[PDB]
């Protein structure tokens, strides 16, 4: 697909046998989802906060589907104002910026 | 240009007679620069924060240049971890996401 930026670029994703809304965020290194039970091993990770750190669970090599494109990558799970698809996942689906 | 997302999409911009580095951020509604003297009238604006609001100065209809494309739009000036080019400016240069 070609997505324009007049609205927030919010897409339907498939992850952990669920459907989620997530923002395509070229400003985010990492992919973070609100609380979801993901399979496999996780390790704790500290991400940056309004005067402090947030502890999240890091799952490696998680299958996602973004507008029908599969992508394996790291997903962080914990407190987030939205599901965010960050650059680690956008590279996997061949997402570029174009003008 | 076509910009891939293996690295942060940081571009050279021209604004207020200065050169700045800024992140292309599809996750940002608005364009925010670190302290710069911009011409014209500004009004105060509250944007969201780690447990609170940040007061910034809103300049309307400011010329920018991103990789040689001119774009008029709103620029916010105040405390920001980086220059951020948000969607209000990316639409003006015809920036899309593509995969």
| β-pair partners for A52 | A49
| β-pair partners for B54 | B47
Chain B residue numbers touching A91 (CB-CB < 8 A)? 4-6
Other Cβ atoms less than 10 A from the Cβ of B39: the count is 10
- In terms of Cα–Cα distance, which of A16, A68, A82, A96 is closest to B9? A96
Spans of all domains in chain A: 1-99
Q: Which A residues in the span 9-48 are in contact with B, Cβ-Cβ below 8 Å?
A: 9, 23-29
Q: Please give the DSSP secondary-structure letter assigned to residue B79.
A: -
User: What 3-state DSSP class applies to A90?
Assistant: helix
Residue of chain B whose alpha carbon sits nearest to that of A25? B27
Residue of chain A whose alpha carbon sits nearest to that of B69? A99
B25 catalytic residue (yes or no) = yes
Q: What is the Cα Rg of chain A in Å? A: 13
Q: Is A68 exposed, middle or buried (0-12, 13-18, 19+ CB in 10 A)?
A: exposed
Task: Check if the beta carbon of residue A30 is closer than 8 Å to that of residue A86.
Answer: yes
Task: Check if the beta carbon of residue A96 is closer than 8 Å to that of residue B26.
Answer: no
Secondary structure (DSSP) of B50-75:
TTEEEEEEEEEEEEEEETTEEEEEEE
B71 touches chain A (CB under 8 A): no
Which residue is associated with the tokens 């609100």?
A34
What does the alpha-carbon distance between residue A52 and residue A80 come to, in Å, rounded to a whole number?
14
- Resolution stated for this PDB structure, in Å: 1.6
Cα dist from A42 to A33, A34, A39, B35, B47, whole Å: 14, 15, 9, 40, 34
Which architecture characterizes domain B1-99 according to CATH? Beta Barrel (2.40)
Phi, psi of B20 (to 5 degrees): -135, 150
Q: Please, which experimental method was used? A: X-ray
User: What 3-state DSSP class applies to A7?
Assistant: coil
What does the alpha-carbon distance between residue B75 and residue B58 come to, in Å, rounded to a whole number?
6
Shortest Cα–Cα distance, A40 to chain B (Å): 26
Across chain B, which distance is largest between two alpha carbons, in Å?
40
The structure tokens listed for B55 are 């007061």
């Amino acid at each position: 697909p070609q997505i324009t930026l007049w609205q927030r670029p919010i897409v339907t994703i498939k992850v952990g046998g669920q459907l989620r809304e997530a923002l395509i965020d070229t400003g985010a290194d990492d992919t973070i989802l609100e609380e979801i039970n993901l399979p496999g091993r996780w390790k704790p990770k500290l991400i940056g906060g309004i005067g402090g750190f947030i502890k999240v669970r890091q799952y490696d090599q998680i299958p996602i589907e973004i507008c029908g494109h599969q992508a394996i990558g790291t997903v962080l799970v914990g407190p987030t104002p939205a599901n965010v698809i960050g650059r680690n996942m956008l590279t996997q689906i061949g997402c570029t910026l174009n003008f």
